[PDB]
Design a protein around this ligand. Structure first.
Ligand SMILES: [Ca+2]
Ligand SMILES: [Ca+2]
Ligand SMILES: [Mn+2]
Ligand SMILES: [Mn+2]
Ligand SMILES: [Mn+2]
Length: 316
């Protein structure tokens, strides 16, 4: 669409009011011209054909409940784009300001969200297990980070390389949650998961075992489900990343925390410079160590903590 950039107002999934960037041309569209080549949000109208219709609204006000997921998908994509640019100097997922597209209201009762290789897709949830998934900034940021990985390391979606791919998305989705200061934690999906139950989440980075995911290499899943456990074994890496950031003692191994910022710096460097499509956990450790070395020196604490963290989860 070609039109006039403007700002509208609406309410997100959780009922919070926010301003969003829109474009005016007869209708007001969810098209944000302020970031790279734009952020565009589409209505999939409960169908599975994609992307659907670019979101059009008559009055620049998005307070209808059908609007909620679109508002959040649109807003949180902006935040994520900001994170990457401000923090890592990366312009969009491709590093070249590629347009970011998302569709909401995908299918009916669909309890998931995903990056399909070209755009983001969000289900509305069945209302019991989930509410519309775009209401979780960690979810949005996890998905958009898959785009980042696709254009960089290109980690294949299966086995260890696939678990790394998943852990990368949880790590950065959590760093984005902290960046925006939106009730941050080391949990994944807490805001949209099981509305009826307080205190839970989909996955825990601080304690993966809490939901039955492995927190040590000796406990890894070796079967074939979930693409070889990409969503299970990511727990081992998630735990490592939490320790590097926060510190702690795990299985008798002590790790001094170096904080979130450095965690993000080290992981982003590993991702963009050292990982390859077939990298395994052991290769990830080597990459993380080389990155920290690059950034802080071989005899740094940073390096030391990265080592301790992997020893703690049993990754050699
Ligand atoms: Ca979270
Ligand atoms: Ca819940
Ligand atoms: Mn309206
Ligand atoms: Mn994922
Ligand atoms: Mn949170």
């Amino acid at each position: 669409i070609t039109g006039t950039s403007t700002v509208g107002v609406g309410r997100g999934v959780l009922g919070d009011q926010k301003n969003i960037n829109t474009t005016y041309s007869t209708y007001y569209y969810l098209q944000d011209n302020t970031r790279g080549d734009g952020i565009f949000t589409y209505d999939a109208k409960y169908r599975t054909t994609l992307p659907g219709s670019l979101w059009a609204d008559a009055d620049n006000q998005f307070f209808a409940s059908y609007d909620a997921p679109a508002v959040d998908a649109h807003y949180y994509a902006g935040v994520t784009y900001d994170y990457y640019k401000n923090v890592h100097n990366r312009l969009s997922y491709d590093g070249n300001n590629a347009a970011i597209r998302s569709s909401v209201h995908y299918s009916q009762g669909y309890n998931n969200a995903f990056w399909n290789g070209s755009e983001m897709v969000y289900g509305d949830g069945d209302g019991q297990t989930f509410i519309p998934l775009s209401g979780g900034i960690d979810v949005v940021a996890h998905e958009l980070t898959h785009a980042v990985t696709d254009y960089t390391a290109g980690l294949i979606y299966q086995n260890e390389s696939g678990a790394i791919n998943e852990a990368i998305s949880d790590i950065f989705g959590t760093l984005v949650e902290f960046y925006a200061n939106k009730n941050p934690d080391w949990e994944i999906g807490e805001d949209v998961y099981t509305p009826g139950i307080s205190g839970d989440s989909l996955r825990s980075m601080s304690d993966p075992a809490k939901y039955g995911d492995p927190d040590h290499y000796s406990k890894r899943y070796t079967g074939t489900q979930d693409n070889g456990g990409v969503h299970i074994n990511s727990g081992i890496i998630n735990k490592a990343a939490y320790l590097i950031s926060q510190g702690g003692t795990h299985y008798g191994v002590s790790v001094v925390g170096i904080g979130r910022d450095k965690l993000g710096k080290i992981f982003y460097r590993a991702l963009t410079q050292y990982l390859t499509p077939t990298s395994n956990f052991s290769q990830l450790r080597a990459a993380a160590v080389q990155s920290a070395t690059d950034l802080y020196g071989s005899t740094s604490q940073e390096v030391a903590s990265v080592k301790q963290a992997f020893d703690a989860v049993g990754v050699k």
